[PDB]
Subunit: 368 residues, 4 copies
Amino acid sequence: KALGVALIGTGFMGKCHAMAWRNVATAFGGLPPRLEVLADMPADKAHSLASSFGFARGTADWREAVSDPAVDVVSITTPNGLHREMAEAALAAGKHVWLEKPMALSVEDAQAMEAAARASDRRTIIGYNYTRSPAFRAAVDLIAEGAIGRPIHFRGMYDEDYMADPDLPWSWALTRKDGGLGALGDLGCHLVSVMVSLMGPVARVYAQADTVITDRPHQGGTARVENEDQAQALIRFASGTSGEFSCSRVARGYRCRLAWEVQGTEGTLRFDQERMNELWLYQPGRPEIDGFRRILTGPAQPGFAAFCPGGGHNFGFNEQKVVEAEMLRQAIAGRGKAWPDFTDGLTIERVIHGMATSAQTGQPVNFL
Amino acid sequence: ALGVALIGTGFMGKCHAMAWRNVATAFGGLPPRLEVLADMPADKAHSLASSFGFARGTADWREAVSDPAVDVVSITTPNGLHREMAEAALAAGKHVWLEKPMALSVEDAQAMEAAARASDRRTIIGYNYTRSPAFRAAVDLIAEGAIGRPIHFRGMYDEDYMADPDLPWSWALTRKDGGLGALGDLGCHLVSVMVSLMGPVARVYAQADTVITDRPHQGGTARVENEDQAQALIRFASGTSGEFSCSRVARGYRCRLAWEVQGTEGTLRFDQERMNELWLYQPGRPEIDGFRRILTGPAQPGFAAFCPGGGHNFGFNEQKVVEAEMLRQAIAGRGKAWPDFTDGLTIERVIHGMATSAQTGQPVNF
Amino acid sequence: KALGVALIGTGFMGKCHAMAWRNVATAFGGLPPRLEVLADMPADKAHSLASSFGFARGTADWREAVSDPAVDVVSITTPNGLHREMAEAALAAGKHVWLEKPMALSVEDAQAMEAAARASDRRTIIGYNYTRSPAFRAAVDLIAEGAIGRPIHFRGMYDEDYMADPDLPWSWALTRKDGGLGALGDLGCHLVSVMVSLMGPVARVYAQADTVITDRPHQGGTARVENEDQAQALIRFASGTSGEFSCSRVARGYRCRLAWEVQGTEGTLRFDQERMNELWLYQPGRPEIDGFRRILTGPAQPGFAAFCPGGGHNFGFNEQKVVEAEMLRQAIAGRGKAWPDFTDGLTIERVIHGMATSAQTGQPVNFL
Amino acid sequence: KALGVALIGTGFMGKCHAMAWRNVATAFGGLPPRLEVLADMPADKAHSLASSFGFARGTADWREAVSDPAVDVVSITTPNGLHREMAEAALAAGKHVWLEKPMALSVEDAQAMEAAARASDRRTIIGYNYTRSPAFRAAVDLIAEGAIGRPIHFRGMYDEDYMADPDLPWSWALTRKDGGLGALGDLGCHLVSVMVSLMGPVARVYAQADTVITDRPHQGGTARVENEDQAQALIRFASGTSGEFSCSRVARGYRCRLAWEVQGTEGTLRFDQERMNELWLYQPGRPEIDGFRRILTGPAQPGFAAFCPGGGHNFGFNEQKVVEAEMLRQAIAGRGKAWPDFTDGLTIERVIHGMATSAQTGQPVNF
Ligand SMILES: NC(=O)C1=CN([C@@H]2O[C@H](COP(=O)(O)OP(=O)(O)OC[C@H]3O[C@@H](n4cnc5c(N)ncnc54)[C@H](O)[C@@H]3O)[C@@H](O)[C@H]2O)C=CC1
Ligand SMILES: NC(=O)C1=CN([C@@H]2O[C@H](COP(=O)(O)OP(=O)(O)OC[C@H]3O[C@@H](n4cnc5c(N)ncnc54)[C@H](O)[C@@H]3O)[C@@H](O)[C@H]2O)C=CC1
Ligand SMILES: NC(=O)C1=CN([C@@H]2O[C@H](COP(=O)(O)OP(=O)(O)OC[C@H]3O[C@@H](n4cnc5c(N)ncnc54)[C@H](O)[C@@H]3O)[C@@H](O)[C@H]2O)C=CC1
Ligand SMILES: NC(=O)C1=CN([C@@H]2O[C@H](COP(=O)(O)OP(=O)(O)OC[C@H]3O[C@@H](n4cnc5c(N)ncnc54)[C@H](O)[C@@H]3O)[C@@H](O)[C@H]2O)C=CC1
Ligand SMILES: O=C1O[C@@H](CO)[C@H](O)[C@@H](O)[C@@H]1O
Ligand SMILES: O=C1O[C@@H](CO)[C@H](O)[C@@H](O)[C@@H]1O
Ligand SMILES: O=C1O[C@@H](CO)[C@H](O)[C@@H](O)[C@@H]1O
Ligand SMILES: O=C1O[C@@H](CO)[C@H](O)[C@@H](O)[C@@H]1O
């Protein structure tokens, strides 16, 4: 009863999934998942990485990975443009699916995938790995327990500078048709996954966006950048509470600055993913000792004890994916719900596309 | 020497008194003459005139402003009294150092702006967060192209002085007698910093909330009418984007005026709770690439007048000594003071525009 | 042709070694090591953890694991008092050894193990995993490149609070005979491993030490704490350069505070393991922009690109052990020297034991 | 009945004292001290700075300032080699003395000054201004209240880089005869003032020291730096508790890094003067919220409310000196004892000179 695993793609997220599947039973116990099929192109790369990743075989044929009888679950980590075709084929073949974010390039493709997931009766989860840190999970539990009273404001950002260099060449990812959203698709969807986990569903957005580098080098000429480098939005949650939201792929000096804070009637929680082992908690205290606490990640926080019994031994980015794999393992076993599945993921896609629509039309966008 | 009248002795009154006393110590020239202190009641004016070193105390602010030995008036009274006192001081031909915000309404600020122009006297408003060496260094770095072209501003001003729901109701929490809430107490400060970094505001879209809607009032409750918190998206006259917020109920924050300017070639970041640090990112070789912590010292504007050695932390109160020197130099015709009542009216239009936007659910253009 | 692995112990370090062996080829390439035998007591635990760790078999007899013909390298993660017996048996059986720190309870035992390692033509490495972070390795390279000129001062500390609470029960680890050193053995050896890597060898120490909680709950009575809760030393390096050194197991609020700085003639480097992804570098700059740089760990630093292509995705404590495994793998393949081996480890044992002696006699101890 | 003030020197500390005397009554109430005589050289500089500082007159003659009948108290902010002559003259003239640190160049000098202060029956205070921050004073009160349980370790450092540049010229401050100690005299004495205020008296030190830049430019040539650029020491307190101690004037990137922590059996306090408005306090808490608190300086802390009613409005370095002035003012009025006076200051001189002796001889020094 070991879970049979297929992996499609071996890049940033492909290798991250491979490391997660390899150690999920080391951390959490039970039977090690069997690493059956690795799909990647070209074939010589799939063969080489299948060998070093410990997959029983590599193939250049992604459909082989979704249709092998020894496969129960498929990790899909290919470019956004391929997610709908590969996820639907995996569900149609009766496989559980771990799909990297975002779901697809459009709300329409995500809607089709959401319907296909319901029809398949298989488990799905989307790769929102910033919801998996012990610090983030600890913050959600502290809010649930009334540690900061009633939330009254959310402020969140996700700054990186991977596109700040204007000489970085044009690519398909910078077109609407083949790339979908820009910073909202690469980073915004992550901040939404964290924001709605803390504050509940979004009822309304009003957004602005900018393209800072509007044209890029392309084969001796230049081509237009058609999606946003940065976006900001004001939020009304279904609770009526306010929010501030931003993302940027051109924010110089920032590498993984997913940073958020929840202000409540009885305290404040604050976090920055660049220091993912620290959670700042303010609660009213006597005047002589009053102030924010630095909570350093350790075994009191969800998931941490599976990796290390001693506090302050920093939890890493890649271990978030081991926690994500375990949540999908337990969901497949009927011992837990995985979040977000394709239904909860579709809502996230509607929010980021709603922000893009609001920025273009200059109108607030309402949900439900 | 400049003859000084001071009206009020509270948070800002005592801050102005300390500033007028040491402005020549820091910057040279003749010490201003501390001529008349006005406060109520008379006993308190006489007591604080003695300890603050003013030649006399009065309970009559009107005769304080009319005194021929007075050249300049510090006005540190509640918001509702700013218009009457500033107009009376300008009418008596005195220069005016007025605390923020200008008044309760744009209408009031417009009348004050007209009176200031008609008086041919110098005015400055108490936007003291524009006076830190770190802030002034950041403006100079942007002017030198240290971060290329600004592409985004993000600013906040969080405090928690009204977070306790048991704090009593006051006339400050009514629209008619209090004006704006967090936008008037804190928002105006963040605007003074934001437009100094990014230039004028073209458009705002705002949201606001009253978080604690009823407070204790005489064994009963009374309704809070103005906002505890407000947020806005900004479009600058330059076409650049901004994020803006303020709050008087943000638990754990005491003076968190924090801002960030992201440019095409770097980033500047600041937090007033650590007012001696300026964070600068510029691209560097990969082995050493990262933000620099610039600790305030004599390389930054104003610091060397207070201390010859870097890392000896500059204080909130010393911002007011810099503010006094800027007014002194304006009065001597050796510098232009910012913001005067004309510059100040623009800031009033922005915070009232944010309030209007939050009420209507519509953007406001300037 | 893949390395055959035996693992003895399954605790804090046992599980850390198991996760390292499982992902070393995922991160760095080549053939995944074969997880052949896991040894632990009792046998039921050995069989259970062999299953979840992915070892081919579990045994309650460690001697039988180190003699297995399918085993080439032995990870020893057992308590300090068993290190000598198990390392000597593994070397005698012709196996390479990955030994957890400290080497043993006494210099006498470390001396015997060092002679054994040498008598064998097998590779050894000791688990000084704080020398493996990208930030630390980056700092060593910056010093060698002259980024801070000549070191003029070292200041290092290693504070934790795992024994700070007077309520915490007595254990055999708090006796000289069965526990060996206190804070110097648990934490001090780690700080020495980092300090001599930055500054070069120790020539002289003058030390103080204290047992600050002298008795602890034991069987409804109390028992005496015999070894040190904290120790501090002034250092002279062979270079002539000065140092400050401390460790503590009773330092309230600290969880993994291995923190050090190197002050040089042309700059300063500063590091804190509780924020293991930040390296602080000061070099003189023009007055308007002069200040320390926060270098955030990313692919420019040694080892990081094997785990993640994007900077600011925090490297974790456990990933230090994957780097350590790779260094031992490459040393076994004859394509790099592993540090520290049992010879370099014996020097570290002599330094911490010299500090303990200096504190006891009130006299400096010389090593050269 | 206003206190009459003489100020000797107008440099870093002279101007800091001038600003403190000017606003001490503004902050704390009572009668503003009268700024009577400022002494500095040359005369035109004394006249110009007396005018801008608000002193009734300037003179080039420090003895004129000390002897003026309108003067009750003398601020002495001159170089270390002049402290003894000027302090003894002020005490002999019947004036209270606010003396900058360190007291003098030698223990022998400090002993003579300590005797002169007792004979004069005048108040003395030494300018250990880092003991005056609201954060420091709050930490001392928290330790006394048992907030960290029993102290078990002190670790303190004081790093600056004002001499890190080898091209900074030689001065008489860098000879032992005319300059006394190096980093131990400039910074070490400050760290001792904070350390003994937290941990009580020092019983034993073992120290090491180095001169990193042994020769400096002198009038186109070179001259020898005779005193230490950095020093480190292990401490035993009279309590039996351990300490670590260091100072440096060549620690690149540090500007005012007086940083200390006290570890106790029920908590830890930690502070860094470069962020002088933050005090870090760890006390045990339930595991879900356990961690250090950032205490931001505000009106709950000693002295702060005299300057500002609102927390988080950063208290400045210069306002430490306004607090120091107030402590001396109250001591003169018989309404409080000022610390350290020349008797408590002599003990601090013995500790820093004992560290220098320990570093020179390679032997521990007992007190
Ligand atoms: N959760 C997270 O933090 C992160 C998620 N991602 C997501 O990972 C996904 C991939 O990222 P990208 O930058 O687009 O590319 P990438 O190069 O990082 O990975 C794409 C992988 O898919 C393989 N591939 C491409 N076409 C294929 C085909 N037809 N059959 C089999 N394999 C194929 C490539 O060879 C490569 O191994 C995206 O959905 C992206 O949004 C990326 C970075 C971080
Ligand atoms: N720039 C800044 O950072 C700050 C500015 N302020 C501003 O300062 C002004 C006053 O607020 P605070 O100083 O906090 O209030 P406060 O209550 O501390 O001081 C008000 C002073 O005005 C006096 N006063 C009232 N009515 C008077 C009258 N008819 N004649 C003479 N004196 C009178 C009061 O007795 C008191 O001394 C406000 O406009 C406020 O917005 C306040 C705090 C900080
Ligand atoms: N490098 C580092 O960062 C760290 C190193 N260590 C070191 O790791 C070693 C073990 O400490 P922990 O892992 O914390 O202890 P632990 O109690 O968590 O693990 C000890 C393991 O050895 C096993 N064991 C004991 N006797 C055995 C026997 N006769 N045969 C087979 N297995 C046996 C135990 O069942 C247990 O699995 C120590 O040498 C310690 O100094 C510990 C923590 C961190
Ligand atoms: N407590 C603190 O934080 C600080 C204390 N200090 C102390 O302040 C004192 C002065 O500092 P330095 O660096 O030596 O010099 P400095 O140049 O900062 O100040 C010396 C002042 O004394 C004046 N002076 C020199 N000889 C004089 C004489 N014969 N008569 C009248 N005035 C004379 C100088 O013109 C100058 O105004 C020293 O004792 C030093 O330790 C210095 C900096 C900070
Ligand atoms: O999903 C992501 O997108 C990458 C860029 O495509 C970012 O670098 C990652 O930090 C982020 O996790
Ligand atoms: O203008 C201000 O208003 C006060 C509230 O009334 C805030 O506490 C101050 O920080 C701020 O400078
Ligand atoms: O080797 C170690 O010893 C443990 C205690 O035994 C500490 O908690 C660890 O941080 C350290 O790595
Ligand atoms: O007393 C002091 O000595 C100066 C050096 O002379 C340092 O720069 C100051 O920070 C220190 O307070």
